[PDB]
Amino acid sequence: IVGGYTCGANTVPYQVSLNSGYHFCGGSLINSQWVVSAAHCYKSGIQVRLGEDNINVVEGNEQFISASKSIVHPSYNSNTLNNDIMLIKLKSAASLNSRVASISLPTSCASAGTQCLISGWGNTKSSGTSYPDVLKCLKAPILSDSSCKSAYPGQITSNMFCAGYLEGGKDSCQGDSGGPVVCSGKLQGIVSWGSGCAQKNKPGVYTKVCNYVSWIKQTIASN
Numbered sequence: 001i002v003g004g005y006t007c008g009a010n011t012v013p014y015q016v017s018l019n020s021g022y023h024f025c026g027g028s029l030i031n032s033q034w035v036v037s038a039a040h041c042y043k044s045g046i047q048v049r050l051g052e053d054n055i056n057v058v059e060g061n062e063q064f065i066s067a068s069k070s071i072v073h074p075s076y077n078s079n080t081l082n083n084d085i086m087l088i089k090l091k092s093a094a095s096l097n098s099r100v101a102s103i104s105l106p107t108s109c110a111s112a113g114t115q116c117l118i119s120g121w122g123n124t125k126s127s128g129t130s131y132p133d134v135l136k137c138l139k140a141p142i143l144s145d146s147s148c149k150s151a152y153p154g155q156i157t158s159n160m161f162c163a164g165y166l167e168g169g170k171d172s173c174q175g176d177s178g179g180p181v182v183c184s185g186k187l188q189g190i191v192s193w194g195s196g197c198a199q200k201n202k203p204g205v206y207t208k209v210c211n212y213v214s215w216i217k218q219t220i221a222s223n
């Protein structure tokens with residue numbers, strides 16, 4: 001996250017860190033047994049780490065649970081990143097408490113102008129590399145689809161939306177992949193892609209979760 005702030009330990013209780021020996025993607029807890037992340041974050045051998053703040057220090061509120069199965073969307077296209085969403089089932093149910101909570105799925109899509117909260121442990125420099133150990137947060141609005149499509153001609157589908165600032169300065173970045181974009185108490189997006197980080201007229205692109213609620217609900221009830 002570039003131009004954001006330190007969230008505060010466990011102030012984003014649904015935030016997840018996917019670990020395969022190191023942190024490589026974020027995710028969101030939707031109920032005690034399931035996590036939603038980005039399909040481009042798919043790997044075999046994932047351990048989900050809940051209740052984390054500093055990912056390099058065991059502070060006492062973490063739960064490390066291995067994944068029993070991963071399901072990448074049936075229509076994920078790695079070349080265009082269309083349908084960039086995946087579900088991960090935990091081997092054991094997590095214990096929900098104040099520091100580990102799940103986030104709600106949306107009932108309808110959010111409107112341009114709505115302010116959201118984006119979080120993650122990704123790079124904090126637009127021109128450089130500095131990975132933080134504690135969770136960073138960024139409040140950003142959803143942009144109009146026309147400004148999103150003008151920045152990325154022929155690349156945005158109806159399953160994506162842009163959020164951020166066209167002036168540049170504040171944005172999600174590498175390492176933030178798979179993490180949450182929460183607006184009005186619902187999970188509306190997943191950090192998916194962009195061009196550089198915090199560049200002018202190059203906002204971040206997010207998977208539009210409101211288009212996948214039926215697929216999510218149906219898949220978790222049959223697995």
Ligand SMILES: NC(=[NH2+])c1cc2cccnc2s1
Pocket residue numbers: 171172173174175176177191192193194195196197198203204205
């Ligand atoms: N600028 C963004 N919002 C980006 C997010 C990601 C996520 C993965 C890879 N590259 C990028 S750029």
Ligand SMILES: [Ca+2]
Pocket residue numbers: 052053054055056057058059062
């Ligand atoms: Ca920790």
